[PDB]
């Protein structure tokens, strides 16, 4: 029975290698990765791969791996798929740990914009979780952490991480990670998956997919929000993506809203992640 080697980049930046039967469904690989990670609260996570256009795609756990990666390498990343709006309601510390690791990459990558002070506060909790209590002997006036905190590091930021780290004496790792999450969850771009699009007039917008619905950034700022409950039907056709909105009170008709995506595969990807968010955050 023939097996294909899988390589998975984990959220700590390390590479997990395993073998699955070549006709395996995505769930098979995901189950192996989650067992490796000692992860029980698996519903929030997924694997990604890069298609022939180099676009990130979720690996569908219900479909054959070979029919998704097609002509590409069996190489994946382990990622948060559904960002919980209240991470304190997760049952296990280790789930919150993996969510912290994802958010640290969201921040360094610039997907999750963050004020100077919030960058320093998040960094101070990460340092407290990983090294424990502040030790002066390790850090002098010229200290620069190995930890990546931000898309652009400054000496001022490193200084502010140290100043806040000093305030966290006695804090345990789960405690520090919970504080990390209480701050991160409030950020306006927390768990927002952004897709480039044009409105029905050709004006460049971003569509953000998240727990609280579909966001339209008509400028660079959120100019419209469609909460999932209002959305009855999501669909795509050629390069276009549509949402069917519930009739408002006393309104005769539903309303269908249409957008232009970069190509047909980008419309399909946006449709799939919207359907998946709608389902997940309907049940949560
Ligand atoms: C940051 C982790 C990641 O890769 N997320 C992801 C992956 C794929 C898509 S999709 N299928 O293009 O909508 C959206 C978001």
């Amino acid at each position: 029975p023939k097996s294909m080697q899988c390589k998975v980049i984990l959220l700590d930046g390390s590479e997990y290698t395993c073998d699955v039967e070549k006709r395996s469904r995505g769930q098979v690989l995901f189950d192996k990765v989650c067992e490796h990670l000692n992860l029980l609260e698996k519903d929030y996570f997924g694997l990604t791969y890069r298609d022939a256009e180099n676009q990130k795609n979720w690996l569908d756990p219900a479909k054959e791996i070979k029919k998704q990666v097609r002509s590409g390498a069996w190489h994946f990343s382990f990622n948060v798929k559904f960002y919980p709006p209240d991470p304190a309601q997760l049952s296990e510390d280790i789930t919150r740990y993996y969510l912290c690791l994802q958010l640290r990459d969201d921040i360094v990558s610039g997907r999750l914009p963050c004020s100077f002070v919030t960058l320093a506060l998040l960094g101070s909790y990460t340092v407290q979780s990983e090294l424990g209590d502040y030790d002066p002997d390790e850090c002098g006036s010229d200290y620069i952490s190995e930890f990546r905190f931000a898309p652009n590091h400054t000496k001022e930021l490193e200084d502010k991480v140290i100043e806040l780290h000093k305030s966290h004496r006695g804090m345990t790792p789960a405690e520090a990670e919970m504080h990390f999450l209480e701050n991160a969850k409030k950020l306006s771009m927390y768990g927002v998956d952004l897709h480039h699009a044009k409105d029905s007039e050709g004006v460049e917008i971003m569509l953000g997919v998240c727990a609280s619905g579909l966001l339209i950034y008509r400028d660079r700022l959120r100019i419209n929000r469609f909460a999932w409950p209002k959305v009855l039907k999501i669909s795509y056709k050629r390069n276009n993506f549509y949402i069917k909105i519930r009739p408002g009170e006393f309104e005769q008709f539903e309303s269908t809203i249409g957008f232009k995506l970069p190509n047909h595969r980008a419309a399909k990807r946006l449709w799939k992640v919207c359907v998946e968010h709608h389902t997940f955050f309907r049940l949560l």
Side-chain angles (χ1 to χ4, degrees):
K2 182 166 168 172
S3 287
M4 292 296 290
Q5 189 170 60
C6 299
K7 294 190 152 166
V8 190
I9 304 311
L10 305 179
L11 283 168
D12 65 357
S14 71
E15 191 185 67
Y16 169 77
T17 311
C18 68
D19 297 274
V20 298
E21 296 191 354
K22 64 165 176 64
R23 286 260 282 161
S24 289
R25 303 255 157 185
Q27 192 67 42
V28 172
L29 174 61
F30 185 67
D31 283 346
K32 287 189 145 146
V33 173
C34 291
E35 173 191 301
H36 176 75
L37 291 175
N38 200 22
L39 172 61
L40 294 181
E41 293 185 288
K42 296 159 46 177
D43 285 0
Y44 301 91
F45 300 88
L47 299 163
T48 53
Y49 66 95
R50 287 190 161 278
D51 62 21
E53 289 177 307
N54 192 43
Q55 300 306 301
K56 276 191 186 174
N57 292 258
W58 292 102
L59 187 70
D60 192 325
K63 305 180 166 75
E64 291 180 17
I65 297 175
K66 69 178 168 73
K67 295 189 162 196
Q68 306 180 67
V69 297
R70 288 286 181 173
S71 55
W74 295 42
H75 183 284
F76 312 89
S77 296
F78 179 82
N79 293 106
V80 172
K81 185 171 186 189
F82 303 112
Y83 288 71
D86 189 0
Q89 282 172 61
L90 296 171
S91 70
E92 306 200 319
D93 293 335
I94 199 169
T95 316
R96 279 186 279 275
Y97 169 73
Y98 291 124
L99 177 55
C100 286
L101 289 189
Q102 172 75 64
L103 289 162
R104 287 164 62 186
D105 191 64
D106 294 348
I107 290 165
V108 165
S109 75
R111 289 189 299 275
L112 182 48
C114 200
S115 71
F116 176 85
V117 165
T118 299
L119 287 171
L121 193 56
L122 293 179
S124 73
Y125 287 127
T126 292
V127 176
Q128 179 68 25
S129 176
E130 291 206 351
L131 307 182
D133 291 340
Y134 168 81
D135 193 324
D137 302 335
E138 275 171 67
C139 101
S141 62
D142 70 349
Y143 183 77
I144 301 196
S145 173
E146 306 314 309
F147 296 114
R148 302 159 59 257
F149 298 125
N152 295 280
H153 300 288
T154 69
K155 184 51 166 43
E156 194 195 8
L157 176 59
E158 296 288 328
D159 289 348
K160 190 70 167 183
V161 169
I162 289 155
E163 173 192 291
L164 293 173
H165 179 204
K166 288 175 172 171
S167 72
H168 308 320
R169 183 161 307 271
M171 187 173 292
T172 42
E175 195 190 351
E177 287 167 19
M178 186 67 256
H179 286 310
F180 177 105
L181 294 170
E182 294 175 341
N183 286 275
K185 74 177 197 187
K186 297 174 182 200
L187 292 169
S188 73
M189 299 302 290
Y190 176 81
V192 182
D193 177 27
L194 291 172
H195 296 246
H196 290 299
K198 287 171 169 181
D199 63 8
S200 67
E201 292 185 0
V203 175
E204 284 199 284
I205 60 162
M206 295 285 258
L207 294 173
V209 184
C210 67
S212 56
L214 184 73
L215 322 176
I216 314 178
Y217 309 86
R218 275 253 150 61
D219 308 311
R220 162 71 139 215
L221 15 129
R222 157 270 202 64
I223 93 295
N224 201 350
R225 271 196 24 30
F226 301 97
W228 288 127
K230 280 176 164 37
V231 186
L232 294 171
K233 192 153 148 168
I234 314 167
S235 63
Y236 66 93
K237 214 204 206 183
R238 298 257 310 254
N239 297 346
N240 298 328
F241 164 87
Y242 305 95
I243 42 170
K244 188 164 75 177
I245 305 301
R246 217 175 55 217
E249 285 199 339
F250 304 100
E251 280 180 15
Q252 186 168 7
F253 299 118
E254 67 262 43
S255 64
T256 281
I257 307 178
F259 304 82
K260 173 79 70 208
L261 276 292
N263 53 70
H264 173 252
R265 290 169 62 83
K268 177 164 181 295
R269 284 194 307 278
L270 171 55
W271 166 87
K272 201 173 185 174
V273 298
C274 287
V275 171
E276 286 169 336
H277 273 75
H278 190 269
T279 298
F280 189 82
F281 284 113
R282 182 169 60 79
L283 297 166
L284 185 61

